[PDB]
Amino acid sequence: TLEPEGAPYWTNTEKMEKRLHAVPAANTVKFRCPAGGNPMPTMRWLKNGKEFKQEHRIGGYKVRNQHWSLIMESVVPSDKGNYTCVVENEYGSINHTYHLDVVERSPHRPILQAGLPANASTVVGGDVEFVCKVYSDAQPHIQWIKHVEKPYLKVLKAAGVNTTDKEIEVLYIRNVTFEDAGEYTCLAGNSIGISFHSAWLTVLPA
């Protein structure tokens, strides 16, 4: 039966320990602050410490101060931030803050930086370099190949379990020979697809 008057309190802490809410864009998000107290506590939401009105985002949001929750659907990058529930009655005010992280994913084949690797020229005996810079969400597997002996391709360098970023990014060719002239390619593959960029090595005499 009826229980005594007092400042508000959390009735369910188990649906509230998940402080960081990280979801992909367009997903719905629900923050809970299940409260108790008598008189019946009032609930209020702040977005990055400020009054959070309905018109502050497109589509608004649904507040169920029956469920002590805030629901925002179709989450987008402009919603990222801290959400604070301020719950109070005449004897006190408690509160909690969630962190909303909206992630944007790019399910694509690896994107090689425009123009790399670049063609190179050298006198026989000189040194050259080839650079490859890759952008990828899925973990990519990168390697350097040579279109040769004319059967096709020769693997010059490849990424493995513990090879550094620095190592595979630059392909060094020391003491260039005429045999070293030809096409160099940076090959990058992920679970979505493969991309490659070629560079020609011009070897000159002198």
Partner: protein, 135 residues
């Protein structure tokens, strides 16, 4: 989140980061400042990754009973099939036991899920790559 840097693996289930503890056990923590949640992924071939902890050098592995442990060397039990579901979450299937669908998963309590107890209809297997800090 380009692949290069170390990253956090955030489980949809309870909001935990995948953690490889110094004694070799795997669990999940909500503490973003914990030093055992920074993971560097790498690959030997398309769609198959190694997941390594920058803090202690151990690799994630799944034993024959579907148990997650931190391994000191990258062996066949350290190879996970990385799938990006356009649903925009990643899933990690043990390559050794791919036939049986054994998924890396974290329960709502932050303790690891065992291969056998996982399946596609769970939030426990859904991970989201997050940067080490601010995002």
């Amino acid at each position: 989140g380009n692949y290069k840097k170390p990253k956090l693996l955030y489980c949809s289930n309870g909001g935990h980061f995948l953690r490889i503890l110094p004694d070799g056990t795997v669990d999940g923590t909500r503490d973003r400042s914990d030093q055992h949640i920074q993971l560097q992924l790498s690959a030997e071939s398309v769609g198959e990754v190694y997941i390594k902890s920058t803090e202690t050098g151990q690799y994630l592995a799944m034993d024959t009973d579907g148990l997650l442990y931190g391994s000191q060397t990258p062996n066949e039990e350290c190879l996970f099939l990385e799938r990006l579901e356009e649903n925009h979450y990643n899933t990690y299937i043990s390559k050794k036991h791919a036939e049986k669908n054994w998924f890396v998963g974290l329960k709502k309590n932050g303790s690891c899920k065992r291969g056998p107890r996982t399946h596609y209809g769970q939030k426990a297997i859904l991970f989201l790559p997050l940067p080490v800090s601010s995002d």
